Design a protein around this motif. Structure first.
Motif, PDB file in Angstrom:
ATOM      1  N   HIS A  75       1.033  -1.240  -0.082  1.00 43.23           N
ATOM      2  CA  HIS A  75       0.064   0.126   0.044  1.00 43.23           C
ATOM      3  C   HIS A  75       0.834   1.059  -0.072  1.00 43.23           C
ATOM      4  N   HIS A  77       1.166   5.705   1.172  1.00 40.11           N
ATOM      5  CA  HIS A  77       1.041   6.828   1.999  1.00 40.11           C
ATOM      6  C   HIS A  77       1.420   8.007   1.175  1.00 40.11           C
ATOM      7  N   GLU A  87       5.291   8.520   5.950  1.00 38.77           N
ATOM      8  CA  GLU A  87       4.861   8.317   7.271  1.00 38.77           C
ATOM      9  C   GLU A  87       6.222   8.178   8.121  1.00 38.77           C
ATOM     10  N   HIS A 100       4.799   0.673   1.373  1.00 42.27           N
ATOM     11  CA  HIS A 100       5.036  -0.178   2.145  1.00 42.27           C
ATOM     12  C   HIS A 100       4.650  -1.693   1.780  1.00 42.27           C
ATOM     13  N   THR A 181       0.960   1.128  11.727  1.00 44.56           N
ATOM     14  CA  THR A 181       0.774   2.710  11.747  1.00 44.56           C
ATOM     15  C   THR A 181      -0.783   2.873  11.761  1.00 44.56           C
TER      16      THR A 181
HETATM   17 ZN   LIG Z   1       1.645   1.571   5.513  1.00 43.99          ZN
END
Ligand SMILES: [Zn+2]
Ligand SMILES: CCCCNC(=O)c1ccc(SC2CCCCC2)c(S(N)(=O)=O)c1
Ligand SMILES: CCCCNC(=O)c1ccc(SC2CCCCC2)c(S(N)(=O)=O)c1
Ligand SMILES: [Zn+2]
Lengths: 240, 240
Positions: A75, A77, A87, A100, A181
């Motif tokens: 995925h 961010h 992140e 990630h 997270t």
């Molecule tokens: Zn993530």
């Protein structure tokens, strides 16, 4: 609202390279089976939190001798207009976006056994920065965000080399133990953060932060969590 | 015919301090609740393979921030008259004896769930050598061996300061990943081997090697496994 998110050993964190402890023991990342053929296809999904690609069986990863993982999903961010959305930070600097790749230890059969357990999950993370060229690997995914802009929407996409999404040198990374997270914010996650970055065109970065819709009638943006204290953890580096 | 006993990453090993990776991430060990009251008593057993002391609930050991453990038991490895019996060696040197203190990760409620899982079990190891004085802490255990000379016997002993069976230097140690050294030889075990040794008298060392009887009409002596190859693992040290 999940007490686990108030534990002492959370992610993400601010990375400070000069304070990273070098350890020779941290050998080059081994990623086998990541060059996926066009068939079968893979599920890409807007869950209103991120865009998530589901990965097949066969993607094997090792952090060290006898410490092996299998890839589950990836995925992203990201931020918004004039605002970065990684992140992790480096010396306080937030990068444009962040990928990630989430893996499960081969010592556990199920993710629900691995949550909360030391080294149960491992995530590979890389920073995404603005460059001049258009990224081919990322375009395969960015091109399909149009289709799934709704929220809950999902599509199928042809197999791709997952390893082409990642930086150049698999011998240069930072490493620490933290948490998911997102809730449930489970601890015992091994985080590996490439030292080098991957480059996307300003076009691609606008796309990523401006094509998807999240809760209700609202754009999916700034989907990163604030920085969490190290509380005594020392980040390790694979290079002097 | 127990399969993990044939794994690539077994214990014990030969330690070469020249070849250890210095890892500043390795902090001093935290032991809590090891200074016990005399009551309740603890069970000391000749299981025919070693002498084992069952430790009570509430002994917490951390290998570092977020690396938390509870002590289960300790036991000893030894040789025979004029023969060394430590399990680990250093530059090929074998020490007279060795203490192991076995711990369970707080993420797991029972040993069988931890077995083979990464960092699921953690052993604190120290070499025993000959010094000029009777070791007080050791005498409390060694004075009772005569009562448990027979294979499969046991006795109750008063609680004692368990941390006084170990070196006072908790900052200086080697650490590596390996296995249990007796069946089922499961991997994923974090072994921590102190730099400082512990001093016992010649009389104490004789009591240890000459009092207990094992299987057969046989003396319980030389109860150490052969050293196992590193097989590409690196040993870390906590000190330059
Ligand atoms: Zn993530
Ligand atoms: C407010 C924005 C939330 C967006 N986060 C995710 O969608 C997300 C979704 C999933 C995951 S990992 C997953 C693996 C086990 C079950 C739950 C989390 C992660 S992470 N950063 O790898 O911890 C993030
Ligand atoms: C030559 C005959 C064998 C001597 N070893 C033991 O008695 C022994 C007994 C127990 C243990 S620990 C382990 C035993 C099974 C699961 C629980 C902990 C260990 S060790 N060295 O820490 O792996 C050793
Ligand atoms: Zn042992």
């Amino acid at each position: 609202v999940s007490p686990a998110c108030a534990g002492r050993f959370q992610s993400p964190v601010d990375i400070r390279p000069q304070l990273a402890a070098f350890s020779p023991a941290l050998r080059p990342l081994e990623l086998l089976g990541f060059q996926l053929p066009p068939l079968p296809e893979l599920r890409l999904r807007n869950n209103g939190h991120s865009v998530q690609l589901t990965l097949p069986p066969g993607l094997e990863m090792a952090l060290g001798p006898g410490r092996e993982y299998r890839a589950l999903q990836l995925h992203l961010h990201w931020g918004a207009a004039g605002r970065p959305g990684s992140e992790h930070t480096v010396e306080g600097h937030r990068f444009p976006a962040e990928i990630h790749v989430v893996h499960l230890s081969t010592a556990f059969a199920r993710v629900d056994e691995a949550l909360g357990r030391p080294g149960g999950l491992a995530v590979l993370a890389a920073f995404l920065e603005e460059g001049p060229e258009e990224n081919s690997a990322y375009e395969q995914l960015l091109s399909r965000l149009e289709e799934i802009a709704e929220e809950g929407s999902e599509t199928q996409v042809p197999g791709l080399d997952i390893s082409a999404l990642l930086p150049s040198d698999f011998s240069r990374y930072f490493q620490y133990e933290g948490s998911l997270t997102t809730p449930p914010c489970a601890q015992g996650v091994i985080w590996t953060v490439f030292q080098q970055t991957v480059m996307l065109s300003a076009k691609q970065l606008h796309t990523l932060s401006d094509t998807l819709w999240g809760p209700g009638d609202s754009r999916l943006q700034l989907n990163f969590r604030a920085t969490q204290p190290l509380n005594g953890r020392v980040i390790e580096a694979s290079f002097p």
